[PDB]
């Protein structure tokens, strides 16, 4: 079995931050469009 | 023309001349030879005066009778091949063959010998060896005799196969270097069934036939030549031959092919152009189904996984899977199917390494790739989505992290994945993403970006960006970052760049057109195709 | 028409509103022409 | 033209309505010019073919040289042209009429 | 059930392939006339909670003339498609530069969803289709004559030749099943070919309105 370190790297933290920011932007955009 | 007649007692022209030379009265000897030794039938002797009377000599109807008896013999033996007791009649045909092997050298009866040899399922080995010694006898022999000959003749079989392999290479390099830079028609555009129906593949399927040893030896020759020349087309030819034999239901070959399930599944994935989860699990089970002591089979598996069609299908499936993960916002470590696809593609890449190194075990895959490089691709896609939302919300993120560049320039796996991601984002006609990842395209590991396949694919994808090719700055950046890095050095990159320029010459501005025509001037030490492209561009531009 | 073993080509409906809703405006025109021809030529008469 | 007819007319209904009664005109010509349908005649088949081809030009419904107009004219007189070519054949003009 | 539902899905897929082929989209010959057996062997032959579950047979097809123009064909699982599903399909279409979709619903989609669908028309073109209407191909019915969609150039040529304004042509409404089958919009003229028992062949024209 390959060794997969669960520890978050800078790449994974950046990906999670971009995920969250995209979530906020999508929610704001959908709120604007729904009006 | 009449050699070998003396063995059976039928005098030929040599002895006839040698006898008439020292005979004073040839007439009586000739008469006794044509009557007694010839057709001893009173009816023919009575017919002779009438045929003299017509003025048509005995020559013509004697020749007609000889030819019709030859035809009757061949047709009768053709019926004999399917009537009577099999073994007894086969032995009778063998007896006829051993009688007529003395007359095989005389062409007026040689078709009888070749027809008998064709009808007999197994010609005696000495006769086969004597036939192989002469080119005319070999070529005149039917496919059955060729099959019997090739089973024991390693060098002859390889030599006969070689021109077909050369023709396959020639047509493959004519397709990879074709001026039709269209999306609907690329190197992988035809379906696998159509490609296996090509002249070379069908000829190979016919000539290999239903012989296990011949098929195995063809496979081994393909493996050796692929190892020698590093030419990926030979793995494709092996897969095509096996799949064509499977389509024609050659059980003796499908049974002896251990990768039959795996190769059939890969062919199905290529035909459907997407490796689904079910087929991926099937492939994983087949790969893990190789028991201990049979690691050599793994090598064959790897050779199938290095197929350019399979490589392209797996790469596209992995890219789309990563995009689906981004849509699911899933970290790459969390997808076992992604890991399976990465393992499959790494095995395809390392097929040659495993074949040469003889260590029949799957190469280890370092985890920094999945943990860091793939999150960069996901982050680039998320940045694209964020910019799109901001456009819909009340500049473009083009910053390139150093980790992504390092992994693209050092990891062959990351190199290929990023290259196919570039192809995908270019297919969307997205200039901004292309220019963002162009600094990554500047340097790549293994020079896989400089391969013929990837250059052709990139030209086909960029064919949709004529409007952006109307911009001088975009063309300059694209050529400097990727093309001018290897086109002055590599002939293939130069040829593909000139193909792209020729296909998109009128969109390019005159200044950048002159820049491309001048900086990419053909050299004498390069191939003639580059000069032909330059001449074509010169003719068409004015 | 969706039923299996039922011919989806030669199956008519004898009703023009439903044919208009299902098949179209040219199909309803053809069906109306056929219905008129039948109802006029049933008695044996002929109209151009 | 036979294939086209079998496409347009299912159920094998060979009764149609057309302007000119070609058979009756042929009969009238036979009676007017005293054909005597027993001796060989003087009528080159190429004359029949050329006459039919030139006659098809004159019978016009849609007037114009536009490709659209040409197609409309060809469609309008399609059935009559098929009937005329099936009646004024080279063989029939020499074996039956 | 499973076998009858498999047959229904295969028939619907064949109808959709024929529809895409008629609109000029690049459809391979094999998938156009694929019988039931290869469909069973390709998708799983167990639609009820199995391998050929929906959103797996959705198809993306590129136009033959221009590879840059494509269409999605979606098969939502829910019988009554609501605003959430159409919104997520629109969001999926957002990531691509193609704005043509074809939704195959199983029952009447909600009125709010229809309002959103007709609102997003100028940027995102998409049409609904009840699965009942796709169990057959109405174009093969004998009552339906030949329909051809004409380019704007030949429409102008027609209007110039007959010297008539476009409002003088016979009309066809956008809700016509054939019009929805061909995906034609208002202001577009359709040539119709019929076999005429008096002339041999009649070509008429209909304006979408």
Letter string b/e over residues B468-499, b meaning 16 or more CB atoms within 10 A of that residue's CB: bbebeebbeebbebbbbbbbeebbbbbbbbbb
Question: Which pair of tokens denotes residue B322?
Answer: 């990563």
Question: Which pair of tokens denotes residue B536?
Answer: 């074509």
SS3 E207: strand
The residue of chain C nearest to residue E8, with distances taken between CA atoms, is: C2
Give contacts of D79 with chain E, Cβ < 8 Å. Answer: 196, 198-200
B388 close to E94: Cβ distance less than 8 angstroms: yes
d(CA E100, CA E114): 16
As beta bridge partners, residue E70 has E62
Torsions phi, psi for B520 (to 5 deg): -100, 35
- β E202-208/E171-172 pair status: parallel
Question: Which pair of tokens denotes residue E178?
Answer: 């054939």
Residues contacting residue B148 through CB under 8 Å, at least 6 positions apart: B122, B123, B128
E42 close to E161: Cβ distance less than 8 angstroms: no
CB atoms within 10 A of CB B11: 14
d(CA B397, CA B276): 33
Q: Which of B151, B160, B152, B169 is nearest to B228 (CA)?
A: B169
Residues contacting residue B72 through CB under 8 Å, at least 6 positions apart: none
- CA quadruple D8, D11, D13, D16: dihedral, nearest 10: -30
Q: What angle in degrees, to the nearest 10, is found between the helix axes of B412-427 and B431-442?
A: 160
Query: Would you give the distance in Å from CA A33 to the centre of its chain?
Result: 22
Helix (H) or strand (E) holding D60: none
B408 close to B442: Cβ distance less than 8 angstroms: no
SS3 C3: coil
- β E59-62/E189-194 pair status: unpaired
Residues contacting residue B79 through CB under 8 Å, at least 6 positions apart: none
For chain B, state the CA radius of gyration: 34
- β E189-194/E146-149 pair status: antiparallel
B81 close to B119: Cβ distance less than 8 angstroms: yes
Query: Would you give the distance in Å from CA B484 to the centre of its chain?
Result: 32
With contact defined as 3+ CB pairs under 8 Å, the chains touching B are: A, E
Q: What resolution in angstroms, rounded to 1 decimal?
A: 3.3
d(CA B44, CA B28): 18
Q: Which of B487, B486, B423 is nearest to B459 (CA)?
A: B423
Residues contacting residue E189 through CB under 8 Å, at least 6 positions apart: E150, E155, E158, E166, E169, E205, E206, E207, E208
Question: Which pair of tokens denotes residue B506?
Answer: 């009128």
If 0-12 CB within 10 Å is exposed, 13-18 middle and 19+ buried, where does residue B179 land? exposed
SS3 E185: coil
d(CA B301, CA B172): 23
Letter string b/e over residues E35-74, b meaning 16 or more CB atoms within 10 A of that residue's CB: eeeebbebbbbebeeeebeeeebebebbbeeebeebbbbb
d(CA B319, CA B460): 18
As beta bridge partners, residue E104 has E129
As beta bridge partners, residue E146 has E193
Question: Which pair of tokens denotes residue B496?
Answer: 């593909």
Fold that domain E1-136 belongs to in CATH:
3.40.1340
Picking from A3, A14, A26, the nearest residue to B389 by CB comes out as: A26
Residues contacting residue B23 through CB under 8 Å, at least 6 positions apart: B29
Q: What is the DSSP letter of E139?
A: G
DSSP string computed for E14-60: HHHHHHHHHTTB---HHHHT--HHHHHHHH-S--TTSTT-TTSS-EE
If 0-12 CB within 10 Å is exposed, 13-18 middle and 19+ buried, where does residue D56 land? middle
Q: What is the largest CA-CA distance in chain A?
A: 52
B100 close to B109: Cβ distance less than 8 angstroms: yes
B221 close to B161: Cβ distance less than 8 angstroms: yes
d(CA E186, CA E181): 14
d(CA D83, CA B332): 74
Question: Which pair of tokens denotes residue B157?
Answer: 């079989």
Residues contacting residue E146 through CB under 8 Å, at least 6 positions apart: E192, E193, E194
If 0-12 CB within 10 Å is exposed, 13-18 middle and 19+ buried, where does residue D41 land? exposed
Q: Which of B260, B251, B248, B373 is nearest to B318 (CA)?
A: B373
| E207 inside 8 A of chain C by CB | no
In angstroms, the separation between the Cα of residue D40 and the nearest Cα of chain E is: 36
Question: Which pair of tokens denotes residue B412?
Answer: 């062959």
Q: Which of residues 117-176 of E touch D (CB under 8 A)?
A: 157-158, 161
Angstrom CA distances, D2 to B38, D8, D21, E13, stand at 64, 10, 20, 37
Residues contacting residue E164 through CB under 8 Å, at least 6 positions apart: none
Question: Which pair of tokens denotes residue B107?
Answer: 């062409």
Question: What is the C-alpha end-to-end distance of chain B, expressed in Å?
Answer: 64
Query: Would you give the distance in Å from CA B398 to the centre of its chain?
Result: 42
Interface D-E, measured as beta-carbon pairs within 8 A, has a size of 34
Picking from A11, A18, A25, the nearest residue to B403 by CB comes out as: A11
Question: Which pair of tokens denotes residue E1?
Answer: 């059930």
Best probe of the B interface among E32, E97, E124, by most B CBs < 10 A, is E97
d(CA C48, CA B150): 79
Give contacts of C31 with chain E, Cβ < 8 Å. Answer: 143
Answer whether C26 sits within 8 Å of E144, measured CB to CB: yes
Best probe of the B interface among A8, A15, A31, by most B CBs < 10 A, is A15
d(CA B131, CA B104): 10
Q: In the block, which residue shows the tokens 């392209």?
A: B312
In angstroms, the separation between the Cα of residue E198 and the nearest Cα of chain D is: 7
Question: Which pair of tokens denotes residue B382?
Answer: 């998320």
- β E59-62/E70-74 pair status: antiparallel
- β E100-105/E70-74 pair status: parallel
DSSP string computed for B161-203: HHHHHHHHHHHHHHHHT-S---SSS-TT-S-HHHHHTSHHHHH
> Which long-range contacts (C-beta less than 8 Å, at least 24 apart) are formed by D18-25?
D18/D79, D18/D80, D18/D83, D19/D80, D20/D80, D22/D83, D22/D84, D22/D87, D22/D88, D23/D87
CB atoms within 10 A of CB B200: 21
Query: Would you give the distance in Å from CA E107 to the centre of its chain?
Result: 17
d(CA B385, CA B327): 10
B2 close to B12: Cβ distance less than 8 angstroms: yes
Q: What is the DSSP letter of E63?
A: B
Q: Which of E154, E68, D47, E79 is nearest to B429 (CA)?
A: E68
> Which long-range contacts (C-beta less than 8 Å, at least 24 apart) are formed by B201-206?
B201/B168, B201/B237, B201/B240, B201/B241, B201/B244, B202/B244, B203/B164, B204/B161, B204/B164, B204/B237, B204/B241, B204/B244, B205/B241, B205/B244, B205/B245, B205/B248, B206/B143
In angstroms, the separation between the Cα of residue E27 and the nearest Cα of chain B is: 12
Ranges in chain E annotated CATH 3.90.940.20: 137-209
Answer whether B429 sits within 8 Å of E97, measured CB to CB: yes
Q: Which of D37, D18, D15 is nearest to D26 (CA)?
A: D37
d(CA B285, CA B257): 17
Fold that domain E137-209 belongs to in CATH:
Eukaryotic RPB6 RNA polymerase subunit (3.90.940)
Question: Which pair of tokens denotes residue B218?
Answer: 């063809």
d(CA B366, CA A2): 8
d(CA A23, CA B380): 15
Answer whether E158 sits within 8 Å of D68, measured CB to CB: yes
CA torsion sign for B269, B275, B279, B284 is positive
Query: Would you give the distance in Å from CA B399 to the centre of its chain?
Result: 43
Q: Which of E44, E11, E201 is nearest to C1 (CA)?
A: E11
Angstrom CA distances, B295 to B266, B301, B360, stand at 20, 10, 6
Picking from A4, A18, A28, the nearest residue to B382 by CB comes out as: A18
Q: What is the DSSP letter of E78?
A: S
d(CA E171, CA C40): 28
In angstroms, the separation between the Cα of residue C10 and the nearest Cα of chain E is: 6
SS3 A4: coil
Ranges in chain E annotated CATH 3.40.1340.10: 1-136
Chains C and B touch (3+ CB pairs under 8 A): no
d(CA B451, CA B491): 11
SS3 B2: coil
Q: In the block, which residue shows the tokens 């299912």?
A: D10
DSSP string computed for B74-100: HHHHHHHTTSS-HHHHHHHHHHHHHHH
B233 close to B303: Cβ distance less than 8 angstroms: no
Elucidated via: cryo-EM
Q: In the block, which residue shows the tokens 């010998």?
A: B113
d(CA B478, CA B485): 10
Question: Which pair of tokens denotes residue C34?
Answer: 């056929």
Residues contacting residue B403 through CB under 8 Å, at least 6 positions apart: A10, A11, B372, B373, B376
SS3 E124: coil
Q: Kindly report the CA angle at B246 between B240 and B252, in degrees rounded to 5?
A: 115
Question: Which pair of tokens denotes residue E148?
Answer: 């051809």
Q: Which of B526, B459, B516, B482 is nearest to B177 (CA)?
A: B459
Q: What is the DSSP letter of B334?
A: G
B378 close to A16: Cβ distance less than 8 angstroms: no
Interface B-E, measured as beta-carbon pairs within 8 A, has a size of 22
CB atoms within 10 A of CB E191: 16
Letter string b/e over residues B29-67, b meaning 16 or more CB atoms within 10 A of that residue's CB: eeeeeeeeeebeeeebeeeeeebeeeeeeeeebbeeeee
């Amino acid at each position: 079995m390959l060794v997969i370190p669960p520890g978050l790297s800078e790449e994974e933290e950046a990906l999670q931050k971009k995920f969250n920011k995209l979530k906020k932007k999508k929610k704001a955009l959908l709120a604007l469009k729904k009006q | 023309m009449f050699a070998g007649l003396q063995d059976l007692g039928v005098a030929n022209g040599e002895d006839l001349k040698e006898t008439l030379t020292n005979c004073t009265e040839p007439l009586k000897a000739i008469e006794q030879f044509q009557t007694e030794n010839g057709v001893l039938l009173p009816s023919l002797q009575s017919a002779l005066p009438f045929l003299d009377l017509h003025g048509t000599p005995r020559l013509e109807f004697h020749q007609s009778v000889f030819d019709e008896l030859r035809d009757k013999l061949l047709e009768r033996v053709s019926a004999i091949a399917s009537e009577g007791k099999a073994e007894e009649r086969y032995k009778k045909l063998e007896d006829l063959l051993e009688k007529s092997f003395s007359l095989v050298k005389m062409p007026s009866l040689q078709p009888v010998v070749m027809c008998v040899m064709k009808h007999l399922p197994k010609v005696p080995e000495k006769k086969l060896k004597l036939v192989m010694a002469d080119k005319e006898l070999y070529r005149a022999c039917a496919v059955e005799v060729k099959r019997q000959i090739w089973q024991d003749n390693q060098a002859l079989f390889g030599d006969e196969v070689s021109p077909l392999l050369k023709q396959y290479i020639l047509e493959k390099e004519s397709a990879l270097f074709s001026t039709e830079l269209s999306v609907l028609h690329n190197f992988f555009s035809p379906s696998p069934k159509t490609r296996r129906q090509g002249e070379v593949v069908q000829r190979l399927t016919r000539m290999v036939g239903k012989n296990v040893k011949l098929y195995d030896m063809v496979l081994q020759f393909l493996r050796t030549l692929f190892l020698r020349t590093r030419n990926v087309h030979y793995c494709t030819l092996r897969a095509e031959l096996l799949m064509s034999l499977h389509d024609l239901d050659v059980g003796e070959i499908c049974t002896v092919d251990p990768c039959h399930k795996f190769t059939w599944c890969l062919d199905a994935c290529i035909r459907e152009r997407f490796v689904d989860s079910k087929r991926a699990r099937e492939l994983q089970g087949f790969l893990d189904g190789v028991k201990k002591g049979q690691e050599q089979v793994l090598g064959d598996l790897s050779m199938i996984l290095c197929d350019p069609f399979a490589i392209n299908t797996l790469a596209l499936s992995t890219v789309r899977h990563l995009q689906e993960l981004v849509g699911q916002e899933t970290l790459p470590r969390d997808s076992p199917d992604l890991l399976l696809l990465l393992r499959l593609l790494a095995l395809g890449q390392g097929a040659w390494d495993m074949i040469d190194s003889q260590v029949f075990k799957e190469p280890k895959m370092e985890v920094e790739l999945i943990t860091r490089f793939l999150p960069m691709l996901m982050s680039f896609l998320v940045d694209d989505y964020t910019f799109n939302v901001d456009q819909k919300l009340p500049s473009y993120p083009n910053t390139l992290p150093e980790s992504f560049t390092k992994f693209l320039q050092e990891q062959r796996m990351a190199c290929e994945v990023g290259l196919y991601y570039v192809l995908h984002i270019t297919k969307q006609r997205n200039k901004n993403a292309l220019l963002r990842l162009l600094p990554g395209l500047v340097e790549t590991f293994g020079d896989l970006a400089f391969g013929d396949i990837f250059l052709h694919l990139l030209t086909g994808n960029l064919a949709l960006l004529a409007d952006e090719f109307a911009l001088e700055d975009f063309c300059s950046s694209l050529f400097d970052g990727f093309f001018l890095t290897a086109s002055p050095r590599k002939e293939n990159v130069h040829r593909h760049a000139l193909r792209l320029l020729i296909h998109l010459h009128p969109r390019v501005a005159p200044s950048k057109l002159e820049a491309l025509q001048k900086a990419l001037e053909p050299t004498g030490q390069s191939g003639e195709a580059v000069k032909e492209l330059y001449s074509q561009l010169g003719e068409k531009l004015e | 028409l969706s039923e299996k073993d039922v011919d989806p080509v030669r199956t008519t409906s004898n009703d023009i509103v439903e044919i208009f809703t299902v098949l179209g405006i040219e199909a309803v025109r053809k069906a109306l022409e056929r219905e008129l021809y039948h109802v006029i030529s049933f008695d044996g008469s002929y109209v151009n | 033209d036979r294939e086209v007819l079998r496409v347009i007319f299912p159920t094998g209904d060979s009764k149609v309505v057309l302007p000119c009664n070609l058979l009756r005109m042929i009969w009238n010509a036979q009676k007017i010019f005293h054909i005597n349908p027993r001796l060989p005649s003087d009528l080159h088949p190429i004359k029949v073919v050329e006459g039919v081809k030139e006659l098809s030009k004159k019978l016009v419904i849609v007037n114009g040289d536009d490709p659209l107009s040409r197609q409309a004219q060809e469609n309008a007189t399609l059935l009559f042209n098929i009937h005329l070519r099936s009646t004024l054949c080279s063989r029939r003009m020499a074996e039956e009429f | 059930d499973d076998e009858e539902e498999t047959y229904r899905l295969w028939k619907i897929r064949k109808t959709i392939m024929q529809l895409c082929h008629d609109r000029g989209y690049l459809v391979t010959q094999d998938e156009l006339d694929q019988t039931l057996e290869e469909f069973k062997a390709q998708f799983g032959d167990k639609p009820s909670e199995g391998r050929p579950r929906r959103t797996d047979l959705t198809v993306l097809v590129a136009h033959n003339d221009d590879p840059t123009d494509q269409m999605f064909v979606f098969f939502p699982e829910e019988p009554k498609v609501g605003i959430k599903t159409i919104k997520v399909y629109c969001q999926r279409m957002q990531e691509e530069n193609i704005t043509r979709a074809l939704i195959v619903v199983q029952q009447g989609m909600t009125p709010s969803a229809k309002q959103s669908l007709v609102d997003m028309a100028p940027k995102y073109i998409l049409e609904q289709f009840l699965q009942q209407e796709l169990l057959i191909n109405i174009t093969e019915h004998e009552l339906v004559p030949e329909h051809v969609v004409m380019t704007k150039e030949e429409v102008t040529e027609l209007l110039a030749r007959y010297k008539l304004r476009e409002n003088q042509l016979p009309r066809i409404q956008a809700g016509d099943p054939v019009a929805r089958y061909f995906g034609i919009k208002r202001g577009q003229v359709v040539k119709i070919i019929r076999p005429s028992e008096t002339a041999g062949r009649y070509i008429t024209y209909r304006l979408v309105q």
